[model samples]
Target chain A: NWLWYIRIFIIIVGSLIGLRIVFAVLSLVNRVRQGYSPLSERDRDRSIRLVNGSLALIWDDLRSLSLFSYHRLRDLLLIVTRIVELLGRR
Target chain B: NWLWYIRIFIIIVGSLIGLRIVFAVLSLVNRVRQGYSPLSERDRDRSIRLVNGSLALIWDDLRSLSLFSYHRLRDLLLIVTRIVELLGRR
Candidate 1:
């Protein structure tokens, strides 16, 4: 039962990621198709705010999903050192 | 067999959508937690461009999933009109 819940959770999270990527790419393609337009000062400001907000939100999501991280490198290094010390003792 | 494929497709798409929303919300929350700061001129420009691109991408995703739309109103109107016409005939 617990495993079933995990499976369901995975499916839900996986779907969200796939959808986001698909849409992000699709939007990017559409933007390319449409000629780029210059932004006014106001528009630029608004866009910046929006982007900042969005980026923060997206980052949080990734972290929660365990799909994004900054600590991974440190974690990996720690593991490697531990293994090396173990091997030395052996 | 075709139905099975459809079921799989739905599950995959559903998962992606769920994941995207979860992350999006999380990111939003993080942004809120961090106090807003004024952007430098160059930062503003970069943020604007990134936001512009991302908004377009998110829009595209919603459109693909039939989650975001403008034509829903027209579609609903059309269905109502058809139903009325059918009722009148009866």
Candidate 2:
């Protein structure tokens, strides 16, 4: 049981770290896309000064962008369905 | 090692279930916010039909809204900073 507990702890910590890294990379990509400098001191300082700033900002942007993209994708799906319908008529 | 694997499996399954429930409830709240019917068969069918739909949509909304809320919070932080600066001058 004790050994099992240690393994569980390790797995939990490992996964959390993995998750954080994934999000960080995602944030970096998003910020870059928004025309922010990748090597700016202010960007670095802001993230450190407001502990939740970068993380929360990235999370928000990702969420918003995902939905926005999904809407666009749905529109595409609709168009394809329309095309298929027209082809079926012919 | 066998026991360890079993424990890990349980933890992973447990967390996934917990995460799924949390997001489902969040999606329900979000839909309600958007003026969707809470008891609509279409709403219920859509979620069941598109397994990734509800989960991904909720994740996106959560991320977007959190950032939106945090921006407001940042404004509050700035006002506090301004007040502190003025008080220090006095």
Candidate 3:
């Protein structure tokens, strides 16, 4: 059924999101532990802003899309994740 | 009973997330429409950066958390939203 597929799709998407956050948080922790206190307040602020904004988008996407029942959500999430990672790299 | 409750919780959480995304997209659209390309390419770029980052985080959050059977995800989302919204206001 579509519902079962959607659930799986959303789970994968959700997992990817989780891994990214863990990496992000770990990076922040490492910097802090190194006494680097190095990331500017602005960078910290920006990261948080970016995170919050994305969360809102997911909610919307889920609400309108039945992400729990479709594969498109997974594809969309992957694309967006890559785009953001690219942006951060630059 | 817990499973039933979990299902409802996820749905509502999903819906709220959906609404937040819609609001965000609408706001972006409004600005773009008003010829507010006035928001520098940097700002535009920044917003996208922010959005992508957030999405990645939410996916991660969901993967690790039972947004499917818990209310923690919803509360956390609300808190993050307030924090980010506050940052933007500044």
Candidate 4:
């Protein structure tokens, strides 16, 4: 039925947004609880800039960053490996 | 109640995942119906590679791509405008 599909669509969109918010909040809390940061690096600055620039919508920004951070773990690992290899080669 | 929180969490996660899948499928069909693309650029190739490499997890891949694509629309517009200006000036 039309209503059924509509309900399902609503549920999906609503839930995903809620889940994203939850994840973002958890990430922010984790950051706060972990002493914000204990290391200094370009990526740290970039992340900080990302969070600050999104101050108007901190929650949404956190959610986006959390998602990005989760997905980019693999790429980050690869970059680290490549840097390590370069260092070793040098 | 703990049960209440658990239910809410489940609903949120489930809905987001469901919505993600729906959007991804819609995008895939859209691409198919639009007769694919004619671009032969590096980014085009990269996108194709992305779509291909995740073949086994195509729906999940598509979902992630859809979310990223939706978010990047603003950036894409800026990039296009910058390119247009570059071409116009030269």
- Candidate 2, B20: how far from true, in Å? 27
lDDT (Cα, tens digit) per residue for candidate 3, span A1-90: 655775676676566555554443443332322212111122333445545555664577575654556765676667777878898886
Off by over 4 Å in 4: A1-42, A52-90, B1-17, B21-42, B56-90
Candidate 4 residue-wise lDDT at A41: 32
Q: Kindly list the per-residue Cα lDDT of model 2 for residues A4-88, writing each as its tens digit.
A: 6767876785676556544444444333222121111123223332344456656776665454656655655577778888988
Cα deviation of A87, candidate 4, in Å: 38
- TM-scores for all predictions: 0.24, 0.24, 0.20, 0.22
lDDT of 2 by residue, B8-69 (tens): 68667545633533543343444433444444334544345334444444344234323456
DockQ winner between 3 and 4, please give it: 3
Q: Candidate 1 residues A1-90, lDDT tens each?
A: 885676567557654555455454233223323323432134454445534454553443344323336665456446545554554574
lDDT per residue for candidate 4 within A1-90, as digits (tens), equals 885676567556654564544543334433433444563333454345334433433333233223355875565456545544654564
lDDT per model vs. reference: 0.46, 0.47, 0.48, 0.45
Order candidates by lDDT, high to low.
3, 2, 1, 4
How would you class the docking of model 4? incorrect
Residue B36 alpha-carbon offset, candidate 2, angstroms: 39
TM-score of the second chain in candidate 3? 0.25
A10, model 3: CA deviation in Å? 4.0
Tens-digit per-residue lDDT, B1-90, candidate 1? 555675587687766565666444333333333223311111322232433355565676566545436665565557677877898886
Worst lDDT run of 10 residues, candidate 3 chain B, spans B24-33
Q: What TM-score does model 2 achieve against the real structure?
A: 0.24
What lDDT score is found at residue A77 in candidate 2?
A: 58
Top of the candidates by lDDT: 3
> Which tens-of-lDDT digit does each residue in B1-90 have in candidate 4?
555665586677666566655544433432332212210011222333334434545666555444365765565557767878898886
